[PDB]
3C-like proteinase (Severe acute respiratory syndrome coronavirus 2), 611 residues
Amino acid sequence: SGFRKMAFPSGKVEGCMVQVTCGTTTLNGLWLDDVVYCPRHVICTSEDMLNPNYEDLLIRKSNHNFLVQAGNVQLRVIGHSMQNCVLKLKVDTANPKTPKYKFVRIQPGQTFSVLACYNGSPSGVYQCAMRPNFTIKGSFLNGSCGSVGFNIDYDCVSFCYMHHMELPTGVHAGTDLEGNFYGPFVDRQTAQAAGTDTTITVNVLAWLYAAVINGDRWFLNRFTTTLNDFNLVAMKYNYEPLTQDHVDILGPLSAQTGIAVLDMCASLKELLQNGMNGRTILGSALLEDEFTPFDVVRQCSGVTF
Amino acid sequence: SGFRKMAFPSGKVEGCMVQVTCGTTTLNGLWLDDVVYCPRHVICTSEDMLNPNYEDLLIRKSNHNFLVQAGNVQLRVIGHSMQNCVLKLKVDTANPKTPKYKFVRIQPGQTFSVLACYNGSPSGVYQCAMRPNFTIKGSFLNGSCGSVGFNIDYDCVSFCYMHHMELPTGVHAGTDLEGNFYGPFVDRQTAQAAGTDTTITVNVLAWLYAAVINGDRWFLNRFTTTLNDFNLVAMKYNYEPLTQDHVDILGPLSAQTGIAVLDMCASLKELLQNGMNGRTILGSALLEDEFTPFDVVRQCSGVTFQ
Ligand SMILES: *[C@](O)(C(=O)NCCc1ccccc1)[C@H](C[C@@H]1CCNC1=O)NC(=O)[C@@H]1CCCN1C(=O)COc1ccc(Cl)cc1Cl
Ligand SMILES: *[C@](O)(C(=O)NCCc1ccccc1)[C@H](C[C@@H]1CCNC1=O)NC(=O)[C@@H]1CCCN1C(=O)COc1ccc(Cl)cc1Cl
Ligand SMILES: [Cl-]
Ligand SMILES: [Cl-]
Ligand code: NA
């Protein structure tokens, strides 16, 4: 028993992290097959960052402008091209530690593991959720750009996030591995802000199921509700709408515990309207929304990679 | 910026995890050089778990009664020995993925990363703290015994925990890698219970410093306290005593933020008295005690957000 915020084992990704330097700028890259992926803002000066023309800055550059270091070995760059906000550096050596992998774009509410890296060296791993406002609540310092986020399914790594920037409120923003930003952000030193965030309702419900599985049941009650009435409560409290698809996804947990989703929604309704009355759930005084239903089922069943 | 419960990258430990089977019992082992370390209760059967005589059970086993599987490869056991509550199986192959490592026995309040493994396959990684009552608050299911806890400061893996059991309150207990239990616990199914736990005061102070580093000052106050008055109050909230060693350890964070340690103690006193009045600190509505001062320096910027 027990329930903890758990990251995937990071070994398969650690063997792909490298250091990329262009001019005075150093950050992290992801070395898969014979390509190194990194943020296209590695080619910029601070002057350029104020208003960069990446097209023009890149055509100006050549292969020899890029220093790629894998541990203590230099990788020779033999080609370069841009895809959206990601730079692709073709190298002369395929990474022998390349795992089975895909590039995937995740949806708000989905979680993933972040491998925080500095100078090509992994430093820490933690779990994040793509927020509804397309930020993540990460922990990133200067030099962390190019750190990646991922999920693992059996032996296949699904890369979903590459880190690019921090916003004034201390949250973080990045791209998928095809260089498309999550959220209405751009890779420029300019005025940008996180939008008002909301709470991921289906994930709070999943975590209430995790709590019941772990013996924490004080918030269960005799009442049930409907999707329509609950969604009016959700809107009042800046919770995301609950869809029928969300209800279907939670179906397993409902069966195991004997609390119908709409039964649990009646529990959540009362918690929103009345608070916790000094009590905790799974050790928390806040309603947790960074566990997906799959995260709960996978942790409560001991799935292995 | 940001502040998260951050584990060490687990790859160096993943390459050491194996599956050990004896009889009908399967659990995880740790393969370092030519030795596999695992909980000695892998040699026990149903009847044996109340009062096992491990010396008598082990003498009856041959090297070939132990099946060790590294991925898809069976490792040949060529010797065995028991050290406290750990079984050491000598195998004929040294692990080519063995990292630089050491064994360290940690003190209550220290943190480490846990690599949860089932059938020698890693499932996830998370941070834990050794509680004052010598338990950890983990996430461990049947089959997780032999999973290990570690730190990786400066590229060397310090193994500090091997998982053996779950107590009735849902918390967890195990040994160092020399097989000595943390706390008064034994590898028997007789009745055992964790003592009353307390909050790790020096870690709550470290986390309040992390909050200041990251730009939050709302909980500070104009007051100070003596160390003895602080401990008289804090113990009324089931907080561990703060020692002069703890004050010294907090020195670097005090220097970076400009807040004297005993001034932060006065902030903590007020927070215990008042609660947070609907506010949060680093995203939490409770006072967090599973970050050490070292953890804060590891993760946080060296420049305070003033
Ligand atoms: C990322 O670029 C980085 O790690 N850079 C190292 C190399 C580099 C790149 C470009 C130009 C010069 C040098 C950083 C990572 C940020 C920094 C702090 N935390 C992070 O996650 N990203 C940035 O610096 C980006 C790029 C332009 C603007 N930007 C921001 O993050 C904007 O916000 C900040 C920047 C720096 C700090 Cl200390 C704080 C903030 Cl809010
Ligand atoms: C650990 O030994 C294990 O993973 N067992 C699998 C191999 C094995 C060896 C010998 C005998 C039986 C099985 C488990 C891990 C526990 C189980 C649930 N979560 C955990 O962390 N440890 C034990 O079962 C130990 C051994 C003696 C008693 N014990 C306990 O954990 C006592 O409490 C429990 C046992 C089992 C369950 Cl499902 C729940 C509890 Cl609270
Ligand atoms: Cl210690
Ligand atoms: Cl909380
Ligand atoms: Na109900």
Notes: The two ends of chain A are 20 Å apart (CA to CA). Residues A 25, 27, 41, 44, 49, 140-145, 165-166, 168, 172, 189 surround 90X (ligand 1) (CB under 6 Å).
